Amino acid sequence: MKRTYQPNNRKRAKTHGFRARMKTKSGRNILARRRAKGRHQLTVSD
Template identity: 60%
Template structure:
């Protein structure tokens, strides 16, 4: 049986990357919260 998680750098970047997060209001909210927490990595890539 195949597992559900098949890691791929490209797919990861396209769904959770900086440009994708910036596009939506919800994504910007996530980034803002992470900046507030002073995370070193705000998003992937």
């Protein structure tokens, strides 16, 4: 059926992961956004 979910450790991870977000302006942005703003955890945390 091929949905769109097949997760890929390697993938998903990579792609998304503390770092990256960081590395980025943007990413970083929202991130520290989320952080306070909301609490929670985060991607990679995932």
